[PDB]
Design a protein around this nucleic acid. Structure first.
Lengths: 89, 274, 43
RNA sequence: UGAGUAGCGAAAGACGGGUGAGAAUCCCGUCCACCGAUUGACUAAGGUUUCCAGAGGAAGGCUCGUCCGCUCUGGGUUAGUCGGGUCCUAAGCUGAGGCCGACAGGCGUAGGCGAUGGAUAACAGGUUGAUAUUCCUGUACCACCUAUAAUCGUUUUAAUCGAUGGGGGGACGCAGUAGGAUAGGCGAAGCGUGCGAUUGGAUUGCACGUCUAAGCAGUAAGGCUGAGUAUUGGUACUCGUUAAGGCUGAGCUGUGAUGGGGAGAAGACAUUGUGUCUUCGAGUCGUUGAUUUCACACUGCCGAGAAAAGCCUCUAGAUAGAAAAUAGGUGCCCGUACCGCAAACCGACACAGGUAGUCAAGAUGAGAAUUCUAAGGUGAGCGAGCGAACUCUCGUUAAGGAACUCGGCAAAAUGACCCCGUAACUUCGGGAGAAGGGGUGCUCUUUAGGGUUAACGCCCAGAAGAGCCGCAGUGAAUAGGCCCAAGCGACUGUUUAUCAAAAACACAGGUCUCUGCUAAACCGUAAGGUGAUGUAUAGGGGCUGACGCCUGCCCGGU
RNA sequence: CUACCCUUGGUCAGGUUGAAGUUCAGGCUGAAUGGAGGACCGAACCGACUUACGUUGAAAAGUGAGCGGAUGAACU
């Protein structure tokens, strides 16, 4: 369930400047609440989580050659931690 | 009791109102009030079935007891009060055990006077007792038609009826309308006349005052179109143009009787209106 | 000049809209009629 | 085809520099102009990525385009306290059983759902290209859980808790008045700035003088004539009109929160080509006038002005044993970008239209009117010439002054403030701003009330004289033409969205008639409803239409 | 959209007039006080009377200048 709650990390410039602090950004399953996210991070990465914020993103319109559609909707979570650090690249 | 206004304005030129000198308290009793949302003459289908009922002032309902079934206990009168839902004033009484309720207020009622109901009560203004125990000739109000149901006759401001005679289990009585009728002798009634006798002398004065009371205007039938009303118009003004005036629904409306035949109360009506 | 059609999210979902159409027999007729035509949007 | 014709959708731009293949149209600078009870700043609906950065110039943009609300690529919305849900109910909608009905189905009881209302714990500063009461720093508050504990003592009782038990409360209209505070405005100015090159002055020009929730103290007035006893919300007694605060509530003020933050200032940068900031310094006064904010508090009136929960109390009754305090912990879901009186909403359009609420500076004034400005925003997505006829919008005009025309249609004229004067008629209120006259700037004396106030002084002068200037003194803008006599309708109101606003409709008043209550009347096949939680001083229908004086003859016909 | 209604909310710069009532004075009327009204004048706001313009419109009902109501049978 823990490997199914967290989907992948987000690597952008806003997320990197946040990682300058102790904040890490994830894309998570669109059905979970922030308590599940908090407990999943602690189990997978073996750290101590201080807080967690979440937000929802709508689907966007997009084209590929006269084919109008939508992207997937997504859920984003930002995890502040007290002790430890997550190794990424 | 009737105060006249000076003609400072054309609207207030002949207006009249009654001063509220009988009222002794201007705030109702919180425990006996209930909500009363308005219906503008519209039934459970949502359609308008009675004309000319509209949006007046907001009102609360005072719970009045027309039964008077607490017997053998005295009640002392506290105050006379205004009631928006009827033409008579009301009085708040307090029973010896501490209960309060409203009754319609009779003509010569005063604060502090004690009032009583039962079969052994005395013949004095305010008392309620069965018609069997009321001597002939008494003036009486708030009469029942089925024993224990509550008073239904003679409840307007200044209304009264008087007892005439006695049959086996019925009592003769003359109503304010002028008709004489038999009423079951097990039915209660209250002694006296209903107060606020000046109520019908008021001159309303302006169109807006009757709109404050929930009355919307009335359009005459002869200024409508033929598809709207039997008096639907011709060219210019026109006479009635028929053997008899009609209603908006095409039925004669001047002189024709509408009481239904074969009613059970036919045998109780001794003499009708004249 | 005020035009007809002043939009409103709640009014639209309550007058048209799936549950309202399903609450009567003649609304279920509409839904079946649009299914038979192959229409992409039902209410 | 009409034809290189009509149009290019309200308005002020000019020049220098830059970039580019290409510039009236893009970027930067200076000057000029327009709005400013708003073309400024917030919040809703509605829209749904239009938001930001880099790249682009085929189509869209009424011209151009290097630009863009357009195309490509990649990004952006963070909540225990903000608005909803895990709270409450209104209208209304649904409704287990139930009632009715060719079928389909209609109604309705308990109960549910349903805000536009009731309840409800967070503020100041910092920071990004794009979010912030959400992130960061500081300081708080509210629920819930477990430990550490004084008080806890049969669990009747006792502390405790306690009812689908009782009582209170929440809890309410409209108008007016006199106040208390505070916000904001204005003038001296306690410390900052700089001191002029066109004649002159320097006692002179310009400005700032801030700062939260929470916590502690006290407190301007407000309400209750208050405060005990015995008995069944009520009845008898004592101190009473004291209000002393006895009690209850109550705006606001002082401390600290904060030797902190920010700050008119640079005066400290090696630098962040010196910009920006490493860094180090600093002021928090007294006057005046004062709400449209903070009480339906108080007084008055008739048309007599929601509910339920949260909340406070007394209980039947129950149980070790529950109290505050300290220390730890825990705190979900949805929305959050951007436009938003509009180039993004409703109008087919980058459309002179329509779109709920909040904030509201200076001079002048009664004013949110008028003209010019502030804070802030904007220069309108075709231009350059020439100054033809004709059309539109605007100004002036000799002599005459309605001769025009269906008709003074349109225009002109009146207009603010102060003083004087005011008819017929009348329902005695009115008519009335009737008509008709006169005055107004600036300076100096004398007086001189409100006396601003300690006071002439603060300030309108409260007023009288004596002077000066012009064609003209409410020198601009804005601000009633009036009178006489007849129809019609008493009056305020209403009407043919989009050719008729009226003499038409309403109306207060009058009169006739039906209706004794499961009322008559009306909707419905019925059940069920309105009438009405009303009861002849009431309810339905017809005609007339304030008020005054009145309302004649005919009952053969229907 | 529009007509009527139901429940629950919101808005109306300023000036003017001076009803009941009350208090004194005179001898029933005079002065103070008071603050009524489908009252008056006039912005916001709501309307739509006259006129000019527009009529392959800026707009499939508008704009400019005057104009009616503006505490109420008000507007939203």
């Amino acid at each position: 369930e823990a490997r199914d709650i967290l989907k992948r990390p987000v690597i952008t410039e806003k997320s990197s400047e946040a990682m300058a602090e102790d904040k890490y950004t994830f894309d998570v399953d669109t059905r979970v609440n922030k308590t599940q996210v908090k407990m999943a991070v602690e189990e997978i990465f073996n750290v101590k989580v201080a807080s967690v914020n979440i937000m929802n993103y709508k689907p966007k319109k997009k084209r590929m050659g006269r084919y109008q559609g939508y992207t997937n909707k997504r859920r984003k979570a930002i995890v502040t931690l007290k002790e430890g650090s997550i190794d990424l690249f | 009791a009737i105060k006249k206004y000076k003609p400072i304005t054309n609207g207030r030129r002949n207006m009249t109102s009654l001063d509220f000198a009988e009222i002794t308290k201007t705030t109702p009793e919180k425990s006996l009030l209930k909500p009363l949302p308005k219906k503008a003459g519209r039934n459970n289908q949502g359609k308008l079935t009675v004309r000319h009922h509209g949006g007046g002032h907001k009102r609360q309902y005072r719970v009045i007891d027309f039964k008077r079934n607490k017997d053998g206990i005295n009640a002392k009168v506290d105050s006379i009060q205004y009631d928006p839902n009827r033409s008579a004033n009301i009085a708040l009484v307090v029973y010896a055990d501490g209960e309060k309720r409203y009754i319609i207020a009779p003509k010569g009622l005063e604060v502090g006077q004690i009032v009583e109901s039962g079969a052994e009560a005395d013949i004095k203004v305010g008392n309620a007792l069965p018609l069997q125990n009321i001597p002939v000739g008494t003036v009486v109000h708030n009469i029942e038609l089925k024993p224990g149901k509550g008073g239904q006759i003679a409840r307007s401001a200044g209304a009264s009826a008087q007892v005439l005679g006695k049959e086996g289990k019925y009592v003769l009585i003359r109503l304010r309308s002028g008709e004489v009728r038999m009423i079951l002798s097990t039915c209660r009634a209250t002694i006296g006349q209903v107060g606020n006798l000046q109520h019908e002398l008021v001159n309303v004065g302006k169109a807006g005052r009757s709109r404050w009371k929930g009355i919307r205007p009335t359009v005459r039938g002869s200024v409508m179109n033929p598809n709207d009303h039997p008096h639907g118009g011709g060219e210019g003004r026109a006479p009635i143009g028929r053997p008899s005036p009609m209603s908006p629904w095409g039925k004669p409306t001047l002189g024709k009787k509408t009481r239904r035949g074969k009613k059970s109360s036919d045998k109780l009506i001794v003499r009708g209106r004249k | 000049v005020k035009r007809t059609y002043q939009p409103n999210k709640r009014k639209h979902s309550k007058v048209h809209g799936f549950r309202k159409r399903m609450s009567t027999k003649n609304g279920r007729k509409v839904l079946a009629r649009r299914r038979r035509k192959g229409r992409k949007v039902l209410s």
